[PDB]
Amino acid sequence: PVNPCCYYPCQHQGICVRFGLDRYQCDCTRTGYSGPNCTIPEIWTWLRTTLRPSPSFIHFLLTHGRWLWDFVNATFIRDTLMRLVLTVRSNLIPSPPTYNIAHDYISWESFSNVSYYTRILPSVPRDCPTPMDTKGKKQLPDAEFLSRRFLLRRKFIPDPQSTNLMFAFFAQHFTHQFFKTSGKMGPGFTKALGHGVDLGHIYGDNLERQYQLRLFKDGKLKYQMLNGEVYPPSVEEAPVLMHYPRGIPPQSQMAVGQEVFGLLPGLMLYATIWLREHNRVCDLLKAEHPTWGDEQLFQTARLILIGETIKIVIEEYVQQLSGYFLQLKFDPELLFGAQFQYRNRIAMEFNQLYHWHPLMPDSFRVGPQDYSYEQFLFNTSMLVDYGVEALVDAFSRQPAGRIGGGRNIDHHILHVAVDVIKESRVLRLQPFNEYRKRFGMKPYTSFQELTGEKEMAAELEELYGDIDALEFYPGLLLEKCHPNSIFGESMIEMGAPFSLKGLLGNPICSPEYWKASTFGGEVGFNLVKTATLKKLVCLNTKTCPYVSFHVPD
Amino acid sequence: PVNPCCYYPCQHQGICVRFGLDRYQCDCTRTGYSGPNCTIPEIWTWLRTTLRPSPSFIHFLLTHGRWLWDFVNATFIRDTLMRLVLTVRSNLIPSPPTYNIAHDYISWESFSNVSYYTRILPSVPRDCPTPMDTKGKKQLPDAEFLSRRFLLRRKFIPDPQSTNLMFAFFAQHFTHQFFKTSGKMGPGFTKALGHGVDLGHIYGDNLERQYQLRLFKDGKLKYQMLNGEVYPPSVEEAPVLMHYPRGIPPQSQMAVGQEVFGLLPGLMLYATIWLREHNRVCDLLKAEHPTWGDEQLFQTARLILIGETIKIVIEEYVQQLSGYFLQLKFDPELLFGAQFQYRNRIAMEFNQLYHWHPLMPDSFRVGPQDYSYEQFLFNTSMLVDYGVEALVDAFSRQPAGRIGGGRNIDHHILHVAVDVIKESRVLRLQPFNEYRKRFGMKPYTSFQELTGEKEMAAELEELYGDIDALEFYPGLLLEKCHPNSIFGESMIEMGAPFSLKGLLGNPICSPEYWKASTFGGEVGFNLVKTATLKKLVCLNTKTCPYVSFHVPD
Ligand SMILES: *[C@@H]1O[C@H](CO)[C@@H](O[C@@H]2O[C@H](CO)[C@@H](O[C@H]3O[C@H](CO[C@H]4O[C@H](CO[C@H]5O[C@H](CO)[C@@H](O)[C@H](O)[C@@H]5O)[C@@H](O)[C@H](O)[C@@H]4O)[C@@H](O)[C@H](O)[C@@H]3O)[C@H](O)[C@H]2NC(C)=O)[C@H](O)[C@H]1NC(C)=O
Ligand SMILES: *[C@@H]1O[C@H](CO)[C@@H](O[C@@H]2O[C@H](CO)[C@@H](O[C@H]3O[C@H](CO[C@H]4O[C@H](CO[C@H]5O[C@H](CO)[C@@H](O)[C@H](O)[C@@H]5O)[C@@H](O)[C@H](O)[C@@H]4O)[C@@H](O)[C@H](O)[C@@H]3O)[C@H](O)[C@H]2NC(C)=O)[C@H](O)[C@H]1NC(C)=O
């Protein structure tokens, strides 16, 4: 008997449950709808859907009318809108978490065992004909044919929106503090148990690396000093597990907290500037707190860096991504009037969503010369050859690649985008239109409606067979971008809920932690409120390069 | 220079922070008060303190006027009051957690590392003359002299309130799912990382014991069958670490999930009745869900037992403790309108508070005969010699001891109460009057005001020297009880916030989990809503004994 839950009968977050041998029931409890499929609207939900503008229309409002938004930003509405953004987005995500790679249902284990990635939509039941439910081919398209013919960069397409490499590296570094899929345990499992902005990519997955990384005097961290400049220490002085090539000297590695940050120079760059920041904050704390032991200087400085990070990510990072005239604002007090769970756990769909490799260029330009991937990847010397200044300046000037549209992944990195597709299939994610539905959107009715063109659309229909079978990652990357934006709507309406729920679910944003005492008094609390990217690189530097998430357009 | 934070300058939850070499500042952020010590009231907080009745007065209201409360219970106010009780109590406890044995300040480590017990009030700074701050002797009273002369049961004082042993055993069994102090890591550390009603005392601290305890067919658990009755299996069939005496046969142990439950027969008795419940729930689920695999039957049955547990604990357990005419009610929807963090982490003061050993009698009466402690402790055969029925009947008939007043711990168990005092001193808890203050009450001004008499009061002043130095556990147990109640006010106003915050902070109470789908449809959801103690023992039994948290008065 065909498993009824593969027709996806339950609409609007209704929970499909199996009864008897061939029956099903939708749990519509607080879905706001009624009926056997959760399709009969309650009076208020009806009133809201009949008044609810198009997502692309609200994107239009936020991206037009500089005069109106000058007024909004200069008044209190700038706050109310922000509070609305935070609230309406974060509500789409379950809190506490619901599902994981092993359980398509609420369970105490999925709640307890934090080494799972969580899950927004359940799995595709294995007892169903199609691998995507019931629509599509009985075996769906090849992974590297999709990746090669639809994601492979033929010519470089720069970000229409100004995004630079100083941004993309920030996205990688920042992101790998909570995306640590362990090949040892398999797909849908994490080594980063913080599940948020804990700076586990600076301080480590465990207390071991942390102890082997900090200097234990004045709360600082261990550090080399090369050419008169401050850098991370080597495995000789701070011996911790870190992936490197098998031949480089030991005085040439560095110790950071994220095992992979030795590979790319941008990652180790951020490790450097953050570490300098931490030790500087330690200095500022000990200036006012001569009596504190080491570990309080450490923990307080860590909280200050967590605050600075969420601050910069919201007001500059997501600002650059959004293109909104509305100036986003990091004020945790905006949520003190709301029902909000200060708690995050990361979903499968959110790192698969976040694979933004098209941001990487054809080459890496530093100054007048040019480094290919083979020269840039794994390069041990470039980070210290050029001052941190010079690398920030060169990265913040070179454009980054557009993420949407398709055919904009360099051929070197392209293999990641293949594995993700295959990984999607092992994680058994639902069809693109089903996530599309769960994040408040309407499913596409044709491939040509998806891509906004006719060639890739025709071929996509030739491969998948039905739009309802398109896959999560592919369709998310082949969607048409908004006009002059860095990617289309699905990445907006899906990624934004995860990003904001993860940035403000941090307990430092709670009413309990969000006090000046938590950050060693007023100097550190204002140090979190006034943090900027320019302050972060420049305050830890001998000179100011061009530092920005956008090129000098 | 004397550490200023030992004067406890900060009032009303203000955070004492040290500046310079000899300065301090109180963080009064949302304490509702102003000023350098947090003593200047804001207008609304002033209006509330001038209208706030005495805690003992509200205790008077809740414990008098059966007619008025017949009306209140029969109407909707029965709900509003409950929502008030839940809200006002739970607000006293920090969420997310704040402190631990190692950090007297908010830190990412205290947030992350769940093997710590949390902490409501900070430690006593070590750089201070008195071990309790600044008031009292430079070395404070002996532990076993206090315990022997002030806590030792001279004659049995029965609970004025009807409490029986079927209750006290329930309190022990129920409590040891979240109190698992590990002697290996030291004081202020736990093995029960659930920190709540996860039934880790039925299913285990880890997935290992869990797998070695369930039968993996139809989601049930392993089980022996002795005399035609269902019991837990032995270490031969379910081999898991469990403390026992070093000589008893292997076919005489049993496997439960709490390592210590083999020792007392009441503990293993609850282990039995719960296990029978679980397997019965598995049967009920598979009756409607022929298609579910083993592990979904397991996880769903576990959630159902968690719901049954919180239900019984709130509406029967805490009811028996309270003596309130107001019928308490477990409805998680009462908090769906509130700002409430569905998240709990256990504090030091809450297991030290919960050491209720005076509930244990001089002897253990079963039927016409009587077993001394030496006969009852560690007894392997008594649980199976008498039917579970007969043990429930004998325990629910024998009175339990009053907890307050003092001089009511049996000499056998008395040593625990000594260690707790010493353990208090290693955990460096603050003075009794300081917790007294933080839970909304006024510090006692004299020992005779504490005990309500003159003899123990005079000697307590002779030992401690000042009431502001009296200790948490001792003063909590020497306090005068309310008239005809099981203990005084401090146990009420302190323990109630921890108990309710822990009972409703469970994620099954969240809006996300609290659905009929989470509990395998409607039969299990109503099985949680209609759970009672009588249903729990009787539905898993051949006959109904007298089962109640109170004697047949
Ligand atoms: C979060 O979840 C993950 C995944 O659930 C956890 O990591 C996994 O943990 C699993 C269990 O700890 C582990 O799965 C095991 O799978 C089998 C289990 O079979 C056992 O039992 C049978 C029979 O019973 C045996 O018991 C006795 C006891 O001593 C044995 O000697 C005797 O031989 C008897 O038969 C046997 O088939 C088997 O021999 C096992 O004992 C094991 O064989 C596996 O090796 C494995 O241990 C799984 O591998 C873990 N990893 C993954 C990726 O799933 C993770 O721990 C958890 N995190 C937290 C914090 O809870
Ligand atoms: C929750 O918190 C608890 C407590 O914080 C965690 O359990 C504790 O973990 C502690 C650290 O993991 C542990 O303390 C350790 O302390 C001594 C001394 O530590 C040394 O630290 C550095 C390390 O120097 C080492 O360098 C080389 C490099 O590889 C080592 O081999 C070599 O052995 C050398 O020591 C020294 O500079 C310093 O001087 C100290 O000597 C360790 O030696 C102990 O073995 C211990 O591991 C503590 O014992 C743990 N237990 C308790 C009760 O505190 C718990 O893990 C945590 N939970 C989570 C989930 O994070």
Ligand code: HEM
């Ligand atoms: C130099 C450019 C980059 C290279 C070479 C690169 C390479 C890789 C590779 C090889 C993997 C496979 C991971 C694994 O198997 O565990 C991977 C994973 C990943 N990359 Fe990249 N990447 C690059 C840039 C980026 C950027 C710019 C982002 C996003 C902002 C990104 C996000 C990720 C994520 C999210 C993962 C998977 C996370 C996990 O489970 O750990 N990468 N990357």
Ligand code: HEM
């Ligand atoms: C025969 C009756 C009882 C005996 C022998 C008994 C014995 C003990 C002993 C020996 C400890 C030692 C603690 C340790 O070192 O880790 C202990 C702990 C404890 N007992 Fe009792 N107890 C009894 C009844 C009760 C009851 C009725 C309660 C109800 C509150 C209770 C609550 C506790 C608590 C909370 C702990 C500490 C928890 C921990 O850290 O694991 N006990 N008990």
Ligand SMILES: *[C@@H]1O[C@H](CO)[C@@H](O[C@@H]2O[C@H](CO)[C@@H](O)[C@H](O)[C@H]2NC(C)=O)[C@H](O)[C@H]1NC(C)=O
């Ligand atoms: C709930 O969803 C199911 C699945 O989409 C709907 O069931 C199908 O209805 C059509 C039209 O009558 C039938 O031909 C199919 O055989 C049904 N499939 C199954 C699996 O039952 C159902 O109609 C929806 N509920 C309502 C009220 O429309």
Ligand SMILES: *[C@@H]1O[C@H](CO)[C@@H](O[C@@H]2O[C@H](CO)[C@@H](O)[C@H](O)[C@H]2NC(C)=O)[C@H](O)[C@H]1NC(C)=O
């Ligand atoms: C790593 O980067 C360094 C640059 O910092 C490379 O060495 C430079 O190479 C360019 C041309 O490739 C020269 O023009 C520079 O003069 C070199 N500078 C130094 C200090 O060596 C190095 O070759 C790179 N590593 C790899 C493997 O290509």
Ligand SMILES: *[C@@H]1O[C@H](CO)[C@@H](O[C@@H]2O[C@H](CO)[C@@H](O)[C@H](O)[C@H]2NC(C)=O)[C@H](O)[C@H]1NC(C)=O
């Ligand atoms: C805040 O708390 C401190 C400590 O209780 C108070 O300080 C004491 O005040 C008395 C009277 O002025 C002095 O004799 C003591 O020497 C003070 N002790 C210390 C450590 O300063 C302080 O007065 C309180 N603040 C206010 C406004 O009363």
Ligand SMILES: *[C@@H]1O[C@H](CO)[C@@H](O[C@@H]2O[C@H](CO)[C@@H](O)[C@H](O)[C@H]2NC(C)=O)[C@H](O)[C@H]1NC(C)=O
């Ligand atoms: C454990 O309890 C059993 C009771 O079931 C004890 O054995 C009983 O003891 C009483 C009097 O002590 C007798 O009247 C019963 O006839 C005995 N029954 C059985 C089956 O032995 C046993 O002695 C207890 N253990 C200890 C150490 O005292």
Ligand SMILES: CCCCCCCCO[C@@H]1O[C@H](CO)[C@@H](O)[C@H](O)[C@H]1O
């Ligand atoms: C001019 C009005 C600005 C309001 C800012 C709200 C930001 C969130 O607008 C988004 O719209 C989407 C449309 O599909 C919804 O799916 C999301 O739930 C909602 O967060």
Ligand SMILES: CCCCCCCCO[C@@H]1O[C@H](CO)[C@@H](O)[C@H](O)[C@H]1O
């Ligand atoms: C007339 C019945 C009133 C029902 C409401 C009682 C619940 C509120 O309980 C209150 O909790 C506070 C914080 O823990 C304490 O300070 C108060 O003493 C206590 O009354």
Ligand SMILES: CCCCCCCCO[C@@H]1O[C@H](CO)[C@@H](O)[C@H](O)[C@H]1O
């Ligand atoms: C609105 C109805 C009010 C009825 C008057 C109730 C008087 C309660 O009197 C109470 O007596 C207690 C001792 O029993 C004391 O502990 C309390 O301080 C006191 O308020």
Ligand SMILES: Cc1onc(-c2ccc(Cl)o2)c1-c1ccccc1
């Ligand atoms: C792009 C972009 O542009 N605006 C964005 C946004 C944030 C909040 C709301 Cl509401 O919208 C995002 C985004 C940010 C993070 C992840 C994924 C998308």
Ligand SMILES: Cc1onc(-c2ccc(Cl)o2)c1-c1ccccc1
């Ligand atoms: C005893 C007793 O009596 N009433 C109680 C009560 C419940 C809610 C409010 Cl408010 O009061 C309690 C209690 C409840 C939990 C823990 C410790 C004590």
